[PDB]
Amino acid sequence: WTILHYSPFKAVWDWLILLLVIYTAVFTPYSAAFLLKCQPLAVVDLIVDIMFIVDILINFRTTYVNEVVSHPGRIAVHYFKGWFLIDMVAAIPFDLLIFGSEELIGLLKTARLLRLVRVARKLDRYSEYGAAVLFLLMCTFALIAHWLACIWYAIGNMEQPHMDSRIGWLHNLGDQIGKPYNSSGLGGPSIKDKYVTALYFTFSSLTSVGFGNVSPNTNSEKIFSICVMLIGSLMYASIFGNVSAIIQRLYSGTARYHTQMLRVREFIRFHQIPNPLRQRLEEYFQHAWSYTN
Amino acid sequence: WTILHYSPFKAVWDWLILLLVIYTAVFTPYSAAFLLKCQPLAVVDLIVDIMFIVDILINFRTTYVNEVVSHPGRIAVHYFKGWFLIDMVAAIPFDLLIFGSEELIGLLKTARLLRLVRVARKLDRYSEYGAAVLFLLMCTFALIAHWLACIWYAIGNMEQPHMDSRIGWLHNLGDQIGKPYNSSGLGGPSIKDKYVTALYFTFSSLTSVGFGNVSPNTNSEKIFSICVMLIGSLMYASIFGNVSAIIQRLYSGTARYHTQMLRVREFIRFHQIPNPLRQRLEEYFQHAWSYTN
Amino acid sequence: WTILHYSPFKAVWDWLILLLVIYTAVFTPYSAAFLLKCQPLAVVDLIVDIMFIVDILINFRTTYVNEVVSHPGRIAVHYFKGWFLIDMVAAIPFDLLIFGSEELIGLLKTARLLRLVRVARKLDRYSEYGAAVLFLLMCTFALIAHWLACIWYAIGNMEQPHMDSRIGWLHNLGDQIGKPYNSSGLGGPSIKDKYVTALYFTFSSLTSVGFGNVSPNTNSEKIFSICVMLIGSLMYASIFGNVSAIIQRLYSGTARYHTQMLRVREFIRFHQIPNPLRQRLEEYFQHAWSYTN
Amino acid sequence: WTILHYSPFKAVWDWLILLLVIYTAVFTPYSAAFLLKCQPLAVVDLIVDIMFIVDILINFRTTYVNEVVSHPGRIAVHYFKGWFLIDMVAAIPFDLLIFGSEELIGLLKTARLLRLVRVARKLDRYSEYGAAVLFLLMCTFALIAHWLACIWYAIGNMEQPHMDSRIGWLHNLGDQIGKPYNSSGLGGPSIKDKYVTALYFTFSSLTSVGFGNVSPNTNSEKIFSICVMLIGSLMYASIFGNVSAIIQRLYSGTARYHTQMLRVREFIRFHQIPNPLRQRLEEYFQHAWSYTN
């Protein structure tokens, strides 16, 4: 048995694995930042790990181009000469292999972020349709915002229990919603209050608006904000440059239409064309356009 | 009788209905957000509901293309298999169909917003002129800012009477203008203070400038601000992408004129054309340009 | 006698009147907003008014085109039927003709802002050079910020002495700089403190950055800020759209040079041109480019 | 001996002198602003001054063009009549020449910033590669943000020992991090706290976001922010205008590929091409594109 890389199954499988990479890009950074000390998420997370292992076996049973190559020896060698290393490191369950506290074991599952490479390889499939690349550009923006929300909470939570004298962003969140910390550094805002504030501040930093209630005070928070002003000015110019270019690509029929309509309209004015002829020129352009695009 | 879809009457009637759709887009969300619990505005609201019913009668009596079709049976069946459902739901007077508190009758009149579809149906008329497209783009921006101001006041007003402990944006507005709420959660800012502050905050969010006085504190206000930063970055890349394109399209006389005058001037400097001949080249280009555009 | 409109005198005079229009555009709005009830700014204002009256005599003695028309009667009729009405209204010496209080007379001298039309008439001269239209664009941006600073000070100063309860931007300025207003309306910030703050707030609003210290609190300050958010967005779609285009126009020879160099370079790589030949191709491109642009 | 200006030694030397000009552009403004009244950095600072003197001797032995000129006497007089004056003043040992405080000597050594002219000359080398001009454009942005951070600290530090009355940005910093300034002016924020806050405020100002904690209060701070809103809106639009153009230039093969692929895709749909012929058309287009770029 072997799967053809252009078959309708392999198309549906690559679009299914895109959604499981988006699940990984959301819930791995979130669990590593907010949750370090069956449940519905624990069974879903195991299902997703099993499907990323099935995808390794499919990559030993799929054709490739040099026209098609269809022999299991030449297929398995092509995978071992390239991506099989990264696809295996993205799948080794170190949680079942290491014991050294459970903080390290829970953090080590960040190795799953190598699954983003399965989206970097397959841009030949995903970038073919203009409506699908708008979804990838908005998910790239919302995932850059989410990963920065996890780094920003890690930076805050590694300074909140310090000899901080109540200066870092989490102590100010405690005051601002009426949920102050105890003198022990314990209690205070919930995980929803802290995550929603960390995502709000990083969309605020990336889209360059500051409403004044969350702001960086410590040197680590200021250095993070300088880095997010550099990331924001590159990535927002590149992403919304590409979103504008793809919107201009989708609008390009109407953009060419109004341009050629203005040529015909201005030619009619310049020659002062009589009405019985004028209607025939304008109706002809509407016919020749709606026939040929 | 029958109306031609290209007649000067049907042109004026479509440009009149645009102003009644802009009236609907302003005053229906405003009434549903700020006024729920005759005036000159109430008799005008009835007159506008009557004119949107008269427009259904005109749609049963207009010719259409699928060359023109003029037979009333083929007109009626095309409308009934087309927009008549949406046009009728936009015209139902729910005041006469429901009797069970008054708040349901007030809120259900948001079904009038289906009248926005009467603009999207007719972009062939409405988008023909660059001077009309600039008006529609700046009204679409100012209407998105207004609809978000109605949603932002609903989010504030659905938390202000709660067990809030004075954290939401309406309590802060009361303090910031010297109009605080009494212990019952009553009194506070006026409807003018609350509307002008909501509209100020959503233009502030959409144009990405935060002056620091209005800011989102509760998780619903932060999640709304995350949504307005996503909407605002797509909308500002699309609307102000198109507004600058329409400005540069209307500038396409001057842009070609400067570029061609520079090509001629650099040709003159490269060949070092003597003054007796040079003026003939530049005066010819001014004549040929002002003749041909 | 008569002056030829292309002569070096008339060229130097038109570029001198641009500087006197820029003087008018700065110092008339400033005096009419900040300084309502010899010194250098009293005597220079008379010297400038005389030069704007001398310019009316030059317009009665200059050639025009409808080749040139040079007859003094056909010049005088062409000006009397054209711009002379506006140039006369922009010259009436109300200081010497009204006695009716000074608070009206100082405001009535804002009629001098009709001198801005003497620039709109002459864009054929002033737009000829790419470096001169960059100067007009940066002076237009700085003048829009200055005129808005005068409107923002008028809005602040027309509410500060009201039953305000210390809410308008001028009371907050007094508190922030350690120069508080007394309850009598006495003391408070100096005219430099009030002007530099109003110019800062309107560059802040137009470039969409809010540092959090000046913010609009009263309903008129919020309605002003909504107008500046609508102005600043149309202006960035237009002024900084044009500054981008003019900077790319100054860079256009170099932008074409790199584009054509990469086409030569990729042709050389695709054919793998040997070194003895390759230099003769890529040095010939540099010779042909530097010789001809 | 003489060095050929195109040789692989002289290429590596000009890229090494770029990195030493970046060292000068960082550490000269910083030392003149923050460090005013051998050491591990003073040895590096001397080594770099030696290499900027060695570069003058290399320029007395480098060939030049008007085909190449090889003769040392024609080389020397061309350098003496050209850049030698600026290159020499950029290398005078001002450590040795004054006895007149260290406060003058540290200010005087800002003349080393004339080494930026060595990069302004050689843009024929440095701009050749698109990935090198991306590195230059992000270094120009980070260096403008750093030079402004040094001017902003010079403003705050010159006003702080005046009759400031706790209004200027450094007294606010002292309070906001819990390191308040003592009545004798001793202690307060460290040089890391003051520099990281100064750099944070200038990236904040240039990228037009204000998080509300650092803000300009005094008139000189506000006039500086007006200048950074002018410099920011010109430089950010020109730098990220050029980064946008360079990212589009590097992507241009793929942008052309999508444009031409969608012409072929629309042509195939318009003519309704059968599958046996369709595959031959689009497989030919991919074979052709991957061969010719």
From Swiss-Prot, chains A, B, C, D:
Effect on the protein of changing R280P: In LQT2; uncertain significance
Result, substituting C150S: In LQT2; uncertain significance
Entry-listed glycosylation sites: N182
Consequence of substituting D193G: In LQT2; uncertain significance
Effect on the protein of changing S205R: In LQT2; uncertain significance
Outcome reported for the amino acid change (mutating S215A): No effect on cell surface expression, but changes inactivation kinetics
Effect the entry attributes to changing L277P: In LQT2; uncertain significance
Effect of F240C: In LQT2; uncertain significance
Effect on the protein upon substituting D49Y: In LQT2; uncertain significance
Self-association state and partner proteins as the record states: The potassium channel is probably composed of a homo- or heterotetrameric complex of pore-forming alpha subunits that can associate with modulating beta subunits. Interacts with DNAJB12 and DNAJB14; chaperones DNAJB12 and DNAJB14 promote tetramerization. Heteromultimer with KCNH6/ERG2 and KCNH7/ERG3. Interacts with ALG10B. Forms a stable complex with KCNE1 or KCNE2, and that this heteromultimerization regulates inward rectifier potassium channel activity. Interacts with CANX. The core-glycosylated, but not the fully glycosylated form interacts with RNF207.
Record comment regarding domains: The S4-S5 linker acts as a signal integrator where it both couples voltage-sensor domain (VSD) movement to pore opening and closure, as well as providing a binding site for other domains that regulate activation and/or deactivation of the channel.
Protein name as catalogued: Voltage-gated inwardly rectifying potassium channel KCNH2
Lineage: Eukaryota, Metazoa, Chordata, Craniata, Vertebrata
Gene name, Swiss-Prot/TrEMBL: KCNH2
